[PDB]
RNA sequence: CGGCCGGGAACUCAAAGGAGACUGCCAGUGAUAAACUGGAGGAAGGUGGGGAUGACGUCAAGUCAUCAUGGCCCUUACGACCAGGGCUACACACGUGCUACAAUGGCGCAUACAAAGAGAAGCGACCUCGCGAGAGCAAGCGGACCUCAUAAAGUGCGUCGUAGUCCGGAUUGGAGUCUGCAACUCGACUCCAUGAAGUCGGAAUCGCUAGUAAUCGUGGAUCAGAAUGCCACGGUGAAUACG
RNA sequence: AGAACCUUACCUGGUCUUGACAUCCACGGAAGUUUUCAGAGAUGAGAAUGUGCCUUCGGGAACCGUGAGACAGGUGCUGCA
């Protein structure tokens, strides 16, 4: 019913964020299911390094933004308290 | 990449934000073609009396801090060299050595 | 190096490999199947499976000998068209027998 | 010939980034413009305040800028709150080891060069003060008109052990440019602290 | 379950005495080209319990030979989870599976993965 | 053009053609917006295109009623 | 009639030979006339040919298309536009590159 | 008879934390050493594969034109503006790609198979109009769901048949569609017609040893629109490495 | 990692020069808005309207115009600084 999405950059960062979310979820109760990791979006693009004649000189940059989400079957007052201690109704 | 060129860019985007709405309505009544040939003619009238500036056709969206007209990205808003130095000194999240 | 054990014949696997120009495998398989069909007219003594008189050719390791032989065979085969999927085996049997 | 940035290759290895914030495309663009503008503003207004590291964090509609530096009793969020349309707050981290700071030793080298101290004496004092504090590796390099003459040279001094092909090395690298009456002089400083990851 | 050049393949054991259905279709209808049937019959011929036991397979991704190798790894993993003696007899012969031969990443400054462009003097 | 909407003609060229019909005698019809096409009011006129550096006059008649203005005065030259 | 006399060709392929009708125009003409697209002209009877003559003469014919192209190009040349000037001098009109390419338009590569 | 919903967390997938191969073991060779060969186990056996990772210095190599700056010069100016044009011009040569010189080929019909990426002052379901580029309507989606999005070579049937022929597509004409104030120098695409050169390339030269080259397609950055370029991904998939 | 005017750094004709852009002084006016004419546009002359937040109310603060001195501007030269 109530889907709480979250995003981060580092793998350990999104892991500890989802760990804190699932810990306060087990605190509030209401039978919260575990975190749902989703495949990250890789935003790659090549950039010429020098402003003059060199075409083999191009770097490779990687963007790995971790996007996960958790679900709530029924919103209650304790769940909204744990909220106000991305949202989709 | 000059002060005069950045002044031209900021006055261009200012004139675009000012005259966007009436140009948008003119383009809407131009695209809506069911009748009113004379009103279409008057739409072209107002669109020609409107100056050539203040349009996404004029919007070049060059770099911000350097004003480089080449090597631009709509995601970072800067030049290739400046985003390379930004990823080099490390003040933007991500941008590691892509190796797959 | 994978063979084609439908007929066995790693030499015929090499044949369809060198006939697999531009990487088209199924079409080369259809080519070698038409060749097998046109060879089953006589079929010799297991001549539809292996080639005996085609080894000692007019233009000669035994593996390198067979490689040069099949190269000359494919060259003289693809040298002409006019229903190539029969004319190539016609040139092959003319060079063999 | 052309090496890579130690921090730029160890962004996700040993030394983290200086900005933590996520947004969509145009929001990322305007936020990058804003943070670069406020970084340039802070640098050009506190260049004499021994500023070393500027780290920005934006959890949710709020800027948190922490200045990792030494001698914190110089300044005391007004300018960043005026320029940025979102609420902002400042923090100051008075870090130890004021001699192992790359920005600070670059500022000191540029100040000595603008005060016309000799290149060899300046580099020797820098590397001696860096190694006397208890470091493991320090590599300094001065490039461009070694003496203000018509011939440019790249004089570099090394001491101890400064590895660059070891990715678990705690190596910090910083560049700086001094604008003197003979042009500009670019100094590159490398500080190797330890080997842990 | 096994994979081959980005082609997932899931297997299921079911004794049917000659019932081979892939993606709710027969093998002769879904696959073909008179080579895929043979390259999946090649394990089935020597030691694989050709009759008295069949396998329901589903595939996702890949082409023709990639899916054939994926389902071949799937049926050999089914044989491995069935028993270990037949697995050892397959490994004694030339049936070592999980051949990692994927496509190489396109390089920079080149026309393809391992093709440098043409340059004159 | 997309060939369904109105054939584009500029306002200043329109009003100068109106003034030419009134009293302009159709001779000094200097144009700079050669991007505008022609429609059947320009028959037998003497229009001076600014193709290069100055204005060069060209007579336009009914045989060239549907065309473009930049055609009749080129911008290229050979030795 | 006199022109377009091939041997052992289909109707749509045969009708291409007239200067002014090709593959898709032949398909449209045969669809309007109700003629099969695969029957050879040797098996085709003249009862369809007498209708096909008028059906093709409804559109442009060889001589009419040639004289129309000639009058159009001479009209443009006498008007003296950029198109007419490039057609007189042997230069392309649609904005091609005359630096290295346009050899087919310019002629043989003798000098 | 749609995973459509109940049901399940078995399986794929997802992103995490770990593990798995480190000469670990046997035999032989080798100055027991280092090291090498063969073999078992093992998914991977000798840094498994790839990317990234660029030494002191060389070319006083390129950039004071992205930028930063010592000096010299303009300062009613080489400074700011405006419209048209040029950057796309054409006696000629060179370079990198693409399309072909067809029969493993072209075309007509039915039909099998993805990875990866992108999207809101946008992608666009779905319907209708149109031979068409596309137009009106418009739910969903800043997103594993909604959209781009129908992958093609392949398979099955048929058509010709070794010719510039039904290959190929340059050029040109008539008429349309899209973005854009605006498509002529100076965009792209489409309907029809015309369909040229080209029939396998000289001296010579370039890349390539693996599911790489070879062949076919898709996506993205750039951008109002405008790439055979570039950057990524996928389908089929060789021969040779005696030295 | 993209020329249609912009890009444009270039050429033909019209312009403004403490300047298009940053800062100082004294004075007038809040700012802003609709719209006409000459004109290819840059540019000049009009016709109405709005008149605030503070009031030391000879005025604060952004903003528009007038005059000068500093300066500014330069994709102009020198990578052999």
UniProtKB/Swiss-Prot annotation, chain A:
Disulfide linkage: none
Keyword Zinc-finger (UniProt): no
Record-linked InterPro entries: Ribosomal_uS10, Ribosomal_uS10_CS, Ribosomal_uS10_dom, Ribosomal_uS10_dom_sf
Pfam families with a match to the protein in the record: Ribosomal_S10 (PF00338)
Keyword annotations from UniProtKB, A to Z: Ribonucleoprotein, Ribosomal protein, Ribosome biogenesis, RNA-binding, Transcription, Transcription antitermination, Transcription regulation
One GO-annotated biological process of the protein: cytoplasmic translation
SUPFAM superfamilies assigned: Ribosomal protein S10
The UniProt record lists the keyword Transcription: yes
One MF annotation (Gene Ontology) recorded for this entry: transcription antitermination factor activity, RNA binding
Gene Ontology CC, one term: cytosolic small ribosomal subunit
Its job: Involved in the binding of tRNA to the ribosomes. Part of the processive rRNA transcription and antitermination complex (rrnTAC). The complex forms an RNA-chaperone ring around the RNA exit tunnel of RNA polymerase (RNAP). It supports rapid transcription and antitermination of rRNA operons, cotranscriptional rRNA folding, and annealing of distal rRNA regions to allow correct ribosome biogenesis. In complex with NusB is involved in the regulation of ribosomal RNA (rRNA) biosynthesis by transcriptional antitermination.
Matching NCBIfam families: PRK00596.1, rpsJ_bact
Similarity comment: Belongs to the universal ribosomal protein uS10 family.
Name assigned to this protein: Small ribosomal subunit protein uS10
Organism (species): Escherichia coli (strain K12)
UniProtKB/Swiss-Prot annotation, chain E:
Pfam family, one: Ribosomal_S9
Gene Ontology CC: cytoplasm; cytosol; cytosolic small ribosomal subunit
BP GO annotations: cytoplasmic translation
UniProtKB keywords: Ribonucleoprotein, Ribosomal protein, RNA-binding, tRNA-binding
Molecular function via GO: RNA binding; structural constituent of ribosome; tRNA binding
UniProt keyword Lipoprotein, yes or no: no
InterPro entries for the chain: Ribosomal_Su5_D2-typ_SF (IPR020568), Ribosomal_uS9 (IPR000754), Ribosomal_uS9_bac/plastid (IPR023035), Ribosomal_uS9_CS (IPR020574), Ribsml_uS5_D2-typ_fold_subgr (IPR014721)
Disulfide bonds: none
Summary of subunit composition and partner proteins: Part of the 30S ribosomal subunit. Contacts 16S rRNA. Cross-links to the P site tRNA and weakly to the A site tRNA.
Family, per entry: Belongs to the universal ribosomal protein uS9 family.
UniProt function note: The C-terminal tail plays a role in the affinity of the 30S P site for different tRNAs. Mutations that decrease this affinity are suppressed in the 70S ribosome.
Protein name: Small ribosomal subunit protein uS9
Curated annotation (Swiss-Prot), chain F:
Gene Ontology biological process terms from the UniProt entry: cytoplasmic translation; ribosomal small subunit assembly
Pfam families: Ribosomal_S19
An example molecular function term from Gene Ontology annotations: rRNA binding
InterPro entries: Ribosomal_uS19 (IPR002222), Ribosomal_uS19_bac-type (IPR005732), Ribosomal_uS19_CS (IPR020934), Ribosomal_uS19_SF (IPR023575)
This protein's UniProt keywords: Ribonucleoprotein, Ribosomal protein, RNA-binding, rRNA-binding, tRNA-binding
Gene Ontology cellular component terms for the protein in this record: cytoplasm; cytosol; cytosolic small ribosomal subunit
Residue pairs linked by disulfide bridges in the UniProt entry: none
Gene3D superfamilies: 30s Ribosomal Protein S19, Chain A
PROSITE patterns recorded: RIBOSOMAL_S19 (PS00323)
Family membership: Belongs to the universal ribosomal protein uS19 family.
Record note on quaternary structure: Part of the 30S ribosomal subunit. Binds S13 and L5 and cross-links to the A site tRNA.
Function: In the E.coli 70S ribosome in the initiation state it has been modeled to contact the 23S rRNA of the 50S subunit forming part of bridge B1a; this bridge is broken in the model with bound EF-G. The 23S rRNA contact site in bridge B1a is modeled to differ in different ribosomal states, contacting alternately S13 or S19. In the 3.5 angstroms resolved ribosome structures the contacts between L5, S13 and S19 bridge B1b are different, confirming the dynamic nature of this interaction. Bridge B1a is not visible in the crystallized ribosomes due to 23S rRNA disorder.
Protein name, entry field: Small ribosomal subunit protein uS19
UniProtKB/Swiss-Prot annotation, chain G:
Disulphide bonds in the chain: none
One Gene Ontology cellular component annotation held by this UniProt entry: cytoplasm
Keywords carried by this UniProt record: Ribonucleoprotein, Ribosomal protein, RNA-binding, rRNA-binding, tRNA-binding
Keyword Magnesium in annotation: no
GO biological process entries: cytoplasmic translation
Keyword ATP-binding: no
Xref: Pfam families: Ribosomal_S13 (PF00416)
Molecular functions (GO terms): rRNA binding; structural constituent of ribosome; tRNA binding
InterPro entries: Rbsml_uS13_C (IPR027437), Ribosomal_uS13 (IPR001892), Ribosomal_uS13-like_H2TH (IPR010979), Ribosomal_uS13_bac-type (IPR019980), Ribosomal_uS13_CS (IPR018269)
Superkingdom of the source species: Bacteria
Annotated spans, Disordered: 90-111
Function: Located at the top of the head of the 30S subunit, it contacts several helices of the 16S rRNA. In the E.coli 70S ribosome in the initiation state was modeled to contact the 23S rRNA (bridge B1a) and protein L5 of the 50S subunit (bridge B1b), connecting the 2 subunits; bridge B1a is broken in the model with bound EF-G, while the protein-protein contacts between S13 and L5 in B1b change. The 23S rRNA contact site in bridge B1a is modeled to differ in different ribosomal states, contacting alternately S13 or S19. In the two 3.5 angstroms resolved ribosome structures the contacts between L5, S13 and S19 bridge B1b are different, confirming the dynamic nature of this interaction.
Family classification: Belongs to the universal ribosomal protein uS13 family.
Record HAMAP family: Ribosomal_uS13
Protein's recorded name: Small ribosomal subunit protein uS13
UniProt organism field: Escherichia coli (strain K12)
């Amino acid at each position: 019913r109530i889907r709480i999405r979250l995003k981060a950059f580092d793998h350990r960062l999104i892991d500890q964020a989802t760990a804190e979310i699932v810990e306060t979820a087990k605190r509030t109760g209401a039978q919260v299911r575990g975190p749902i990791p989703l495949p990250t979006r890789k935003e790659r693009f090549t950039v010429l390094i020098s402003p003059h004649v060199n075409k083999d000189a191009r770097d490779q940059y990687e963007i790995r933004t971790h996007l996960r989400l958790v679900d709530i079957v029924e919103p209650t007052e304790k769940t909204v308290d744990a909220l106000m201690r991305q949202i989709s109704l | 990449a000059k002060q005069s060129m950045k002044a031209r860019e900021v006055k261009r985007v200012a004139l675009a934000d000012k005259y966007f709405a009436k140009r948008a309505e003119l383009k809407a009544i131009i695209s809506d073609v069911n009748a009113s040939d004379e009103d279409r003619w008057n739409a072209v009238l107002k669109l020609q009396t409107l100056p050539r500036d203040s349009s996404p056709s004029r919007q070049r969206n060059r770099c911000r801090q350097t004003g480089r007209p080449h090597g631009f990205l709509r995601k970072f808003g800067l030049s290739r060299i400046k985003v390379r130095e930004a990823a080099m000194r490390g003040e933007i999240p991500g941008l590691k050595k892509a190796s797959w | 190096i994978l063979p084609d054990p439908k007929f066995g014949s790693e030499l015929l696997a090499k044949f369809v490999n060198i006939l697999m120009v531009d990487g088209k495998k199924s079409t080369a398989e259809s080519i070698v199947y038409s060749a097998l069909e046109t060879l089953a007219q006589r079929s010799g003594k297991s001549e539809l499976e292996a080639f005996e008189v085609a080894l000692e050719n007019v233009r000669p390791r035994p593996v390198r000998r067979n490689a040069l032989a099949m190269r000359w065979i494919v060259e003289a085969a693809r040298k002409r068209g006019d229903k190539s999927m029969a004319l190539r085996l016609a040139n092959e049997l003319s060079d063999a027998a | 010939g052309q090496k890579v940035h130690p921090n730029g290759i160890r962004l996700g290895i040993v030394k983290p980034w200086n900005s933590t914030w996520f947004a969509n495309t145009k929001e990322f663009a305007d936020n990058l413009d804003s943070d670069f503008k406020v970084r340039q503003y802070l640098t050009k207004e506190l260049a004499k305040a021994s500023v070393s590291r500027i780290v920005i964090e934006r959890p949710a509609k709020s800027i948190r800028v922490t200045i990792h530096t030494a001698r914190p009793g110089i300044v005391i969020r007004k300018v960043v709150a005026d320029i940025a349309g979102v609420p902002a707050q400042i923090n100051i981290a008075e870090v130890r080891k004021p001699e192992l700071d790359a920005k600070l030793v670059a500022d000191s080298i540029t100040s000595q060069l603008e005060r016309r101290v000799m290149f060899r004496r300046a580099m020797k004092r820098a590397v001696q003060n860096a190694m006397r504090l208890g470091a493991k590796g320090i590599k300094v390099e001065v490039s461009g008109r070694l003496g203000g003459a018509e011939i440019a040279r790249t004089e570099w001094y090394r001491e101890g052990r400064v590895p660059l092909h070891t990715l678990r090395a705690d190596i910090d690298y910083n560049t700086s440019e001094a604008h003197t009456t003979y042009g500009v002089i670019g100094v590159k400083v490398w500080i190797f602290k330890g080997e842990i990851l | 379950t096994g994979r081959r050049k980005s082609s997932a393949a899931r297997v299921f054991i079911k004794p049917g005495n000659g019932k081979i259905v892939i993606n709710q279709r027969s093998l002769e209808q879904y696959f073909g080209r008179e080579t895929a049937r043979m390259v999946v019959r090649q394990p089935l011929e020597l030691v694989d319990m050709v009759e008295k036991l069949d396998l329901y397979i589903t595939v996702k991704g890949g082409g023709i030979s990639g899916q054939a190798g994926a389902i071949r790894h799937g049926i050999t993993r089914a044989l491995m989870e069935y028993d270990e003696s037949l697995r050892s007899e397959l490994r004694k012969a030339g049936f070592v599976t999980r051949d990692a031969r994927q496509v190489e990443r396109k390089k920079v400054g080149l026309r393809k993965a391992r093709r440098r462009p043409q340059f004159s003097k | 053009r997309s060939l369904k909407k109105g054939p584009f003609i500029d306002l200043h060229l329109l009003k100068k053609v109106e003034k030419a019909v009134e009293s302009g005698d159709k001779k000094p019809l200097r144009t700079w917006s050669r991007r505008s096409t022609i429609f059947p009011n320009m028959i037998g006129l003497t229009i001076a295109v600014h193709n290069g550096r100055q204005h060069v006059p060209v007579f336009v008649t009914d045989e060239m009623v549907g065309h473009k203005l930049g055609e009749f005065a080129p911008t290229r030259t050979y030795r | 009639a006199g022109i377009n006399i091939p041997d052992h060709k289909h109707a749509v392929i045969a009708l291409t030979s007239i200067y002014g009708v090709g593959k898709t125009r032949s398909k449209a003409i045969l669809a309007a006339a109700g003629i099969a697209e695969d029957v050879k002209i040797s098996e085709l009877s003249e009862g369809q040919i007498d209708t096909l003559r008028d059906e093709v003469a409804k559109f442009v014919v060889e001589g009419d298309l040639r004289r129309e192209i000639s009058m159009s190009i001479k009209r443009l040349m006498d008007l003296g536009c950029y198109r007419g000037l490039r057609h007189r001098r042997g230069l392309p009109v649609r904005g091609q590159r005359t630096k290295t390419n346009a050899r087919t338009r310019k002629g043989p590569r003798k000098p």
